[PDB]
Amino acid sequence: GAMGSMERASLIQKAKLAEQAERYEDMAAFMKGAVEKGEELSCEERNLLSVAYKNVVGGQRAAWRVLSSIEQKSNEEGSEEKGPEVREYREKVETELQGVCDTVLGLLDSHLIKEAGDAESRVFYLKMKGDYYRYLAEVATGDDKKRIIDSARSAYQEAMDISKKEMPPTNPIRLGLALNFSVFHYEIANSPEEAISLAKTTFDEAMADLHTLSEDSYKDSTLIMQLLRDNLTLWT
Amino acid sequence: GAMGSMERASLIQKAKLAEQAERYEDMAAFMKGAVEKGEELSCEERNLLSVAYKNVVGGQRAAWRVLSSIEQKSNEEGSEEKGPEVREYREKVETELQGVCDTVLGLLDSHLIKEAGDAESRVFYLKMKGDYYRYLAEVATGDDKKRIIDSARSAYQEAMDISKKEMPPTNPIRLGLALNFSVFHYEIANSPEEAISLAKTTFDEAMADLHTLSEDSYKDSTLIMQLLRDNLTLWT
Amino acid sequence: RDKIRLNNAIWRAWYIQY
Amino acid sequence: RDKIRLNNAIWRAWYIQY
Numbered sequence: 370g371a372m373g374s375m376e377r378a379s380l381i382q383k384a385k386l387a388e389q390a391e392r393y394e395d396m397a398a399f400m401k402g403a404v405e406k407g408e409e410l411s412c413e414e415r416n417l418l419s420v421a422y423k424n425v426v427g428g429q430r431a432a433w434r435v436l437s438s439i440e441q442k443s444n445e446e447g448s449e450e451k452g453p454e455v456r457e458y459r460e461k462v463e464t465e466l467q468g469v470c471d472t473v474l475g476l477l478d479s480h481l482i483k484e485a486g487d488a489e490s491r492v493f494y495l496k497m498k499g500d501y502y503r504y505l506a507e508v509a510t511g512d513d514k515k516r517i518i519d520s521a522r523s524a525y526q527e528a529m530d531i532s533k534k535e536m537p538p539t540n541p542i543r544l545g546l547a548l549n550f551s552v553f554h555y556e557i558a559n560s561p562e563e564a565i566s567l568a569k570t571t572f573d574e575a576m577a578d579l580h581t582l583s584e585d586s587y588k589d590s591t592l593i594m595q596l597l598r599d600n601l602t603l604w605t
Numbered sequence: 606g607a608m609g610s611m612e613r614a615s616l617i618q619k620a621k622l623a624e625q626a627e628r629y630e631d632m633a634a635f636m637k638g639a640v641e642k643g644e645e646l647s648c649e650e651r652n653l654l655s656v657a658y659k660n661v662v663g664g665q666r667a668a669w670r671v672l673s674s675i676e677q678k679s680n681e682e683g684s685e686e687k688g689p690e691v692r693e694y695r696e697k698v699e700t701e702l703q704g705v706c707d708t709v710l711g712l713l714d715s716h717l718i719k720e721a722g723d724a725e726s727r728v729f730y731l732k733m734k735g736d737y738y739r740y741l742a743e744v745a746t747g748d749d750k751k752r753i754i755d756s757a758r759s760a761y762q763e764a765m766d767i768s769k770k771e772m773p774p775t776n777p778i779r780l781g782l783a784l785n786f787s788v789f790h791y792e793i794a795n796s797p798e799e800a801i802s803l804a805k806t807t808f809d810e811a812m813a814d815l816h817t818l819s820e821d822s823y824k825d826s827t828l829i830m831q832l833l834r835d836n837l838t839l840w841t
Numbered sequence: 842r843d844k845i846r847l848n849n850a851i852w853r854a855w856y857i858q859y
Numbered sequence: 860r861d862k863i864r865l866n867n868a869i870w871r872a873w874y875i876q877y
């Protein structure tokens with residue numbers, strides 16, 4: 370692509386600069402460039418990858434939600450419908466969101482999941498796979514929707530299996546995965562009981578083995594634990 | 606362009622939707638589409654135009670400033686310079702900023718300034734001309750810089766002449782123009798005395814004829830008056 | 842941290858509401 | 860309004876400082 374001639378170390382550096390300037394589109398493009406060099410990502414680089422695309426798609430999702438809400442105060446017919454304009458723009462945002470999701474899932478399949486080594490690394494990418502399928506599911510319909518939901522679930526479940534075998538119960542990747550998988554249960558798979566069950570199990574097992582989080586990431590761990598308890602507060 | 610087949614009324618509508626979703630790039634593109642239909646903009650439409658591009662270029666400026674500041678904590682030589690990466694990315698942002706400025710100035714010249722009627726409308730576009738030249742000046746150098754500074758000043762000054770002849774001293778376009786022209790004096794033309802002079806004159810004349818602001822825009826007026834006093838606080 | 846938490850709460854509540 | 864004012868102050872101060 371456009372990043373082919375630039376050194377891998379320069380791409381990482383510029384992604385960090387883009388993060389500082391909150392240019393998440395550029396950040397993503399620099400990290401896509403780095404991933405395409407064909408070498409493993411370290412812990413720090415994987416996080417830069419995730420931060421970039423989560424923020425790109427998060428923006429598209431928030432716009433999608435604004436348009437959807439507007440659209441559904443004035444879809445309820447009988448009153449004024451302004452014509453196709455709201456639907457048209459929402460569909461535009463959707464297509465763009467679909468594009469970015471398709472990109473991340475392509476990098477993951479070609480080839481982050483392939484050439485991972487760490488149990489940590491396999492889980493991190495399988496969790497990402499789950500997430501970007503989940504984002505596709507939020508706006509998809511019909512047969513495409515069912516394909517996507519089973520793809521997300523298949524990725525999440527394999528990530529969880531490995532994580533339960535290979536990672537302490539306070540590991541932040543383990544925790545972040547369970548958090549997001551429980552969100553999938555609630556918001557995508559129409560299984561709120563299984564969402565609550567997972568979130569509570571995850572929190573309680575974290576507490577029971579609190580002695581296991583590490584000097585490097587305990588701050589990440591405690592925040593996700595708090596996020597789990599907040600969702601539980603909301604969902605019960 | 607890409608907006609050629611879409612109805613003018615649909616473009617305006619979608620610009621308003623883009624504003625709500627904070628998609629200022631799309632907002633700008635919809636308004637560029639509307640402007641290209643070749644009809645005058647109303648008061649409301651001119652403001653949508655301004656909001657879109659001010660926010661697009663404001664984003665680029667903030668990124669430029671972040672990169673510039675980073676660059677100038679680690680340009681002061683003797684220590685580590687990481688190579689060309691910070692300059693390279695800053696130059697990229699600059700080029701993009703220059704592009705958007707060149708677009709706005711093109712619309713204004715082809716053809717918003719041409720076919721204006723209102724004294725209000727002429728002032729509004731000549732003020733915009735001043736602003737987008739000012740933004741170019743912040744990052745320009747050499748002979749190009751001097752050309753740009755004289756272009757901004759020429760636009761600002763003509764806007765002021767008309768405004769003093771045609772608009773009450775509390776008119777928000779009049780006030781916003783003087784505010785920005787005083788900022789130009791301070792930040793671009795290296796004339797801080799002339800900046801302070803203008804800002805104080807503008808505020809005092811507004812107060813002396815307070816009875817003139819209108820039921821439609823007094824909220825806009827009082828805010829710019831407060832902005833004038835804040836800059837004065839900063840500059841003295 | 843509390844900003845992160847509040848944003849999360851708003852996003853998750855959105856789904857419940859709409 | 861006060862948000863608008865604070866942002867303006869930060870932007871203008873940036874130039875003075877740097």
Ligand SMILES: O=C(COc1ccccc1P(=O)(O)O)NCC(F)(F)c1cccc(F)c1
Pocket residue numbers: 423424426427500545548549552592593596845848849850852853
């Ligand atoms: O605040 C939210 C709301 O939802 C999102 C918003 C933007 C992007 C992605 C999401 P999501 O649907 O994947 O959760 N989520 C929590 C978090 F930001 F992802 C998160 C997870 C783990 C640790 C954190 F410190 C933060």
Ligand SMILES: O=C(COc1ccccc1P(=O)(O)O)NCC(F)(F)c1cccc(F)c1
Pocket residue numbers: 659660662663736781784785788828829832863866867868870871
């Ligand atoms: O807050 C600022 C800082 O500077 C900017 C930031 C982004 C875009 C453009 C500018 P500027 O250099 O043109 O002022 N400016 C004041 C204002 F936002 F433009 C403004 C003017 C009149 C009335 C307002 F309610 C607000």
Ligand SMILES: [Mg+2]
Pocket residue numbers: none
């Ligand atoms: Mg090489």
Ligand SMILES: [Mg+2]
Pocket residue numbers: 460461463464
């Ligand atoms: Mg669609």
Ligand SMILES: [Mg+2]
Pocket residue numbers: 533
């Ligand atoms: Mg188990």
Ligand SMILES: [Mg+2]
Pocket residue numbers: none
């Ligand atoms: Mg026509």
Ligand SMILES: [Mg+2]
Pocket residue numbers: 696697699700
């Ligand atoms: Mg340049």
Ligand SMILES: [Mg+2]
Pocket residue numbers: 769
């Ligand atoms: Mg005079």
